[PDB]
């Protein structure tokens, strides 16, 4: 009731779990050019001045706790400039026992994995308007875009939307803090399992060809488009292969 916790986690799903795309569609639209610069070349007083603006202009303005978002440029990527960006969140003492540094980097691990897929299909969809006024590269773009759109819909409406709805109900039947601490870290170690975060490093290389493909089309050749097809389709038949050998993790193939 006082210093509420359930009305305090929904202020995290709005930013970390990317439940509101009205703040992102407006933030990357501002800080795109100033993130492609390499690291140790961008001024952090500029990004915070862009984050602080992207909120109040969007629909995230109606939030009591919006003043707790800080930029934190991590040193190592999801094992530069753009692949080293992630929010940071600060809380007071009484609410810190629940959401601590041990259980906040996990919120910060499964965010970058969803900012990376959100970044590529934001540009891979951007090359679509450049070609709209040589004719065999479209049938490959259809194969790539329909794969990242099929990962995100699996990662939002299948893993992080159902598991969160459990936690909301699983906190009304709690009896003590030693249980709320069990239903929270019991929600994070489940998301990082149904997601590919825990190995499946071929996903990282598979997204590598997609960003390169957008780059090639950004310079506007006839012999390299067919190379990407043989390269990208080879990695996808590897992803669908390992995702089949399991005892969810089997419903992904139907996605």
């Amino acid at each position: 009731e006082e210093k509420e916790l359930v009305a305090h986690l929904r202020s995290i799903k709005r930013y970390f779990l990317m439940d509101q795309g009205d703040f992102f569609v407006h933030f990357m639209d501002l800080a795109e050019e100033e993130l492609r610069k390499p690291v140790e070349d961008i001024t952090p007083p500029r990004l915070e001045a862009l984050l602080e603006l992207a909120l109040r202009m969007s629909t995230a303005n109606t939030d009591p706790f919006k003043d707790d978002l800080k930029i934190d440029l991590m040193p190592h990527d999801l094992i530069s400039g753009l692949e080293a960006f992630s929010f940071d969140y600060i809380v007071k003492w009484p609410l810190s026992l629940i959401i601590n540094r041990k259980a906040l980097t996990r919120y910060q691990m499964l965010f970058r994995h969803m900012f990376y897929c959100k970044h590529v299909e934001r540009q891979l969809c951007s090359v679509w308007i450049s070609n709209k006024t040589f004719a065999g590269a479209f049938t490959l773009r259809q194969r790539m875009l329909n794969f990242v759109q099929n990962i995100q819909y699996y990662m939002m409406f299948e893993v992080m939307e159902p598991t969160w709805h459990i936690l909301e109900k699983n906190l009304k039947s709690a009896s003590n803090i030693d249980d709320v601490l069990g239903h929270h870290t019991g929600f994070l170690d489940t998301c990082l399992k149904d997601c590919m975060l825990t190995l499946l490093k071929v996903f990282s290389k598979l997204m590598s060809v997609c960003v390169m493909f957008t780059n090639c089309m950004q310079k506007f050749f006839e012999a390299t488009i067919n190379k990407f097809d043989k390269n990208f389709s080879a990695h996808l038949l590897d992803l669908l292969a390992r995702l089949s050998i399991y005892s969810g993790m089997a419903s992904v193939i139907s996605r």
Binding site: M18, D19, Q20, G21, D22, F24, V25, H26, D29, M57, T59, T62, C125, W128, I129, K132, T139, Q142, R143, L145, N146, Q149, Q152, Y153, M156, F157, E158, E161, P162, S251, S254, R255
Partner: protein, 403 residues
């Protein structure tokens, strides 16, 4: 944000009922005031409306017309005060050539209005056009505006709800206007075909009800954009996932046909969206793309099961040379949820080619005898020759060959 350009009597009405539906959904009073129950609303309003210092909301709409009567009636409606008198334009004083000539004549004020509206939006995304392709007003004026807009704004989307003439029912000069408007649509339009024939067929089995259905289609298409969620948070996301289109909506039920409260799963809806009967428009022709937006409670497990079963039942056919999509939204918190779950479908299918083959057949059925060309020769564009017509016909033929 977005702008709406509605032309001709058809477009003018289309806009009237589209904005009626919008204000109903967002709890906007007829005068532009906001109801007390909707004061704390979470719905995004910037997309179609911009608020005013007087707290009222104004649509991002412009009214165009060669004749005054329709808009004059509109301004006598209870919704009259809502629109912006500045944006509305009426000609002081049925042919495509005449329409394009006027468009050349009245460039300045129209683009003044368009620029004024554009500069009031930070993140304008594209354009929306509502018009009929047969009548003189809609066809020619839309042609001119599309040309000069694609020229002026090379970085904005252009979406249209083009109404096609009835064919089973015999505009006497419809073939020319339709063919020319199609030329312009292929040559400039970014991306929703509409026909009176099948639309009224489904309505059966006044223009007020027909266009109420059309506005329903438009609003359901723009729902998720209006109501931000997780995925598909932009029009460009919509277009990329598909790219000519056709549409269908499951809960097209009268206000009197709510008595049959049928237990409506997601599976049955998404299934219903596939049948040719529900496709509101009238060679093993197959699909190119399918999108299903679902409103109401939805379990992604149900969606996966429905997709699996439909795939196994092979009720659909796809291109052999290339490798659908099911998006979910939330209903407005205000209109009654008479439907447990509802579905809208937009698809690209090769069969649409037939449309043009008819019109081409119609046009070829006239060009061989030079019927009703006297008026066209009057205008400057067709004063010397009609090479425009030949180029348009060949362009449409090329499009049909490509399909």
């Amino acid at each position: 944000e977005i702008i709406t350009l509605q032309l001709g009597q058809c477009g003018n009405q289309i806009g009237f009922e589209f904005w009626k539906q919008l204000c109903a959904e967002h709890g906007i009073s007829p005068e532009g005031i906001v109801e007390e129950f909707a004061t704390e609303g979470t719905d995004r309003k910037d997309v179609f409306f911009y608020q005013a210092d007087d707290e009222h909301y104004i649509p991002r709409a412009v009214l165009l017309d060669l004749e005054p009567r329709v808009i004059h009636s509109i301004l006598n409606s209870p919704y009259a005060k809502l629109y912006n008198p500045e944006n509305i334009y009426l000609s002081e004083h049925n042919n495509w050539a005449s329409g394009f000539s006027q468009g050349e004549k009245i460039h300045e004020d129209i683009f003044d209005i368009i620029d004024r509206e554009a500069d009031g939006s930070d993140s304008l995304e594209g354009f929306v056009l509502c018009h009929s392709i047969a009548g003189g007003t809609g066809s020619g004026l839309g042609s001119y505006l599309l040309e000069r807009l694609n020229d002026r704004y090379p970085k904005k989307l252009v979406q249209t709800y083009s109404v096609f003439p009835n064919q089973d029912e015999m505009v006497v000069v419809q073939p020319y206007n339709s063919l020319l408007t199609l030329k312009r649509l292929t040559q400039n339009a970014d991306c929703v075909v509409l026909d009176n024939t099948a639309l009224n067929r489904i309505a059966t089995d006044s223009f007020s009800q027909i266009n109420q259905l059309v506005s329903t289609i438009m609003s359901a298409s723009t729902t998720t954009l209006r109501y931000p969620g997780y995925m598909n948070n932009d029009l460009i996301g919509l277009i990329a996932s598909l790219i000519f289109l056709m549409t269908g909506y499951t809960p097209l039920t009268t206000d009197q046909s709510v008595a049959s409260v049928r237990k409506t799963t997601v599976l049955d809806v998404m299934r219903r969206l596939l049948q040719p009967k529900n496709v509101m428009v009238s060679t093993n022709h197959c699909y190119i793309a399918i999108l299903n937006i679902i409103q109401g409670e939805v379990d992604p497990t149900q969606v996966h099961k429905s997709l699996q079963r439909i795939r196994e039942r092979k009720l659909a056919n796809f291109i052999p040379w290339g490798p659908i999509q099911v998006a979910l939204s939330r209903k407005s918190p205000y209109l009654p949820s008479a439907h447990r779950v509802s579905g809208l479908m937009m698809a690209n299918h090769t069969s649409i080619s037939s449309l043009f083959e008819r019109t081409c057949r119609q046009y070829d059925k006239l060009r061989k005898r030079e019927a009703f060309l006297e008026q066209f020769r009057k205008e400057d564009m067709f004063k010397d020759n009609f090479d425009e017509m030949d180029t348009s016909r060949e362009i449409v033929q090329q499009l049909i060959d490509e399909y």
